Amino acid sequence: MENLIDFSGDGLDRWLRATFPDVILSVGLTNYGSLMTSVPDLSHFEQMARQAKSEQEKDAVYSKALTEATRKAAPIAACALTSSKEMVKKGLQWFEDQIISEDGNFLVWHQNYEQLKKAPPSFEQLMGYQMSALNWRQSVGYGQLEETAVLVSQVIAQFSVPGTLVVTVQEMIKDMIARRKNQIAQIDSVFSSYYWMWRAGITPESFPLLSDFLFELGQNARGSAKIIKTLDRIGLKWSKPLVNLFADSTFKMGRIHMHPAILTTGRLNEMGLCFGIIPASHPESAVNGSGFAKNILNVRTDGMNPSAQLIVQLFDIQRQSRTLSDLDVVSSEHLFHQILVGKRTAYQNAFQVKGNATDTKIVGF
Amino acid sequence: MENLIDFSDGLDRWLRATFPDVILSVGLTNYGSLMTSVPDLSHFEQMARQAKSEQEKDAVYSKALTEATRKAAPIAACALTSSKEMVKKGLQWFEDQIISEDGNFLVWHQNYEQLKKAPPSFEQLMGYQMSALNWRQSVGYGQLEETAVLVSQVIAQFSVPGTLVVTVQEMIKDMIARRVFKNQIAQIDSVFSSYYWMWRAGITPESFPLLSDFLFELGQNARGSAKIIKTLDRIGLKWSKPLVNLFADSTFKMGRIHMHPAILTTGRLNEMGLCFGIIPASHPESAVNGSGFAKNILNVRTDGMNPSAQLIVQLFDIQRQSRTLSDLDVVSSEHLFHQILVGKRTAYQNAFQVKGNATDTKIVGF
């Protein structure tokens, strides 16, 4: 259909008011305006977790928990900006401009995508990607909101939580350590998602197909096999090149070694942030919410720290649902890492954040 | 047959009796070795570039590694480690612990099968580190500077010849791309793990020379992993069957950097070679011909003209010019370099209690 996320000129603010006249955005529990009015109670997922038997069943419990935890947390204005017609057009055009200018920072990994579906990247390929992300954001004016800012700072040196959560949060730190200058391998969710859109041959015209589908994923967690079967149907013309990018079956090592520009079904959760909180062909449906893991970055860490409250619930559910699966960009400790490097939304770039997240100290209040 | 490495100042006297004519040198090594010159690995470049199959590529690097390390081992430390007295009490420790309910040992040992497939928990890593220290204290392993426990900080500056600075800086970047003691929590104690594997394999003080002779021969010429397995997985070889059964070569997929330090692979036989393969127990005087195992390079000096950096850079260039995709794990050039930066001056020192991050080290030219 059409991309109805369309504004130009206060365009963003005007469009929000025109499209969501009766919606009240809140920052009582989120950093930036969201639909979140309470902290989700995930206590029922423990019993589901315990009764899950197969590896797929256990993964589904955690995926469902994630979706419910994050259903209302996304910063709506940033999502509108990221999916607006003007930004989609500019964001896609950047890649052609880089091909024309034969920018080495882009090409050193782009040209090697097939190899990177199977092997970890070089330092040069990581640095080139980080440079490219900053370049893209500057070129398209992506940093027009606090929500979408480039961070130049230092890691959270101490993280203050309710006393009852201190030990578990400490266990998460330990967990990040056991799982093994700037943040060289950090995924820029927005930049990678635009790169995947461009590689998939998505256009301003076909974008709503992608956005609508991602919104559906945000309504109900799927599962890798199910996602592939859904996108690989004879009905859909737009999705085959996207699926072709998937490294689910090709990358055999741990995903923490995969280059941040390599797509998987799991990393559709990255694209959901950008294009799936508001379904472009029917944006009014956004009032129903849309749950993607890194929505949790917009949950506040001050006050009673609802962010810590949620992350701990997710971490406990993940443990109770323990598989051998590589959860990659939706693992609870990956999300916590993002919180520690200071991301206050999924749309901020944190490459130029110095320090080590694992070095943070957990304090009770 | 018999273990002829046996001394009850017994060490120095055994060295003088067993090696009457050889002068142990520290001109190029931290502790006395057979090394009197720095190997030139230049001929390995061409071979690396014009290697084509993965097995060919890995062979060039492995051959360069053997040549680089052939004479670098600290002989006294090796004799101690393979001595009858140490072999006996070193194995006995595991016999005592397996009936002792020490959780720091059992939390990883009891889950060895699971750890052949999956990364360890923090508890499993810490338990192993504490176990290695416990073992060293218990058997009195730290008798020599060469075999001591390090409590220190990663050195902030590493000084190399000016012509090496750029390449050494590239190695730092490579370490980074590959991704309080937290940074040392997964460090392999080469001696403790080697003793653990010897025990797991059902090797006794009596059958020990079989393992030692095999490893010494292994140190003479690089051998591909499949051929190593063939050597050990013999129809007939009873002694080595439990050893090959420990291998996680095909079971662990995550990337070897995530393997628990007490999990064995064919590649990690290079760890055992340090301990039991520099001197062949049943014929110790054969040791005069050398034995090349990767972490012999930790005994190469970093002062003077930094022969350590000289060799490490040559190995790094050969590895990258070979273009191998293999996860070389404990013989990878940047792994070896990492160990040099945390401050190991032989393979036999424990460096778990070293503060700092090796990748923060500044490279300066002299």
UniProtKB/TrEMBL annotation, chain B:
<dbReference type="GO" id="GO:0003723">
    <property type="term" value="F:RNA binding"/>
</dbReference>
<dbReference type="GO" id="GO:1990904">
    <property type="term" value="C:ribonucleoprotein complex"/>
</dbReference>
<comment type="function">
    <text>Binds dsRNA and ssRNA and probably participates in the packaging of viral genome. In the dsRNA binding mode, the nucleocapsid protein specifically binds to the vRNA panhandle secondary structure formed at the termini of viral genome. Does not discriminate between viral and nonviral RNAs through ssRNA binding mode. Displays dsDNA endonuclease activity that is sequence non-specific.</text>
</comment>
<keyword id="KW-0946">Virion</keyword>
<comment type="similarity">
    <text>Belongs to the nairovirus nucleocapsid protein family.</text>
</comment>
<dbReference type="GO" id="GO:0019013">
    <property type="term" value="C:viral nucleocapsid"/>
</dbReference>
<keyword id="KW-1139">Helical capsid protein</keyword>
<keyword id="KW-0167">Capsid protein</keyword>
<keyword id="KW-0687">Ribonucleoprotein</keyword>
<protein>
    <recommendedName>
        <fullName>Nucleoprotein</fullName>
    </recommendedName>
</protein>
<dbReference type="GO" id="GO:0019029">
    <property type="term" value="C:helical viral capsid"/>
</dbReference>
<keyword id="KW-0543">Viral nucleoprotein</keyword>
<comment type="subunit">
    <text>Probable homooligomer; forms a double superhelical polymer. Monomer.</text>
</comment>
<keyword id="KW-0694">RNA-binding</keyword>
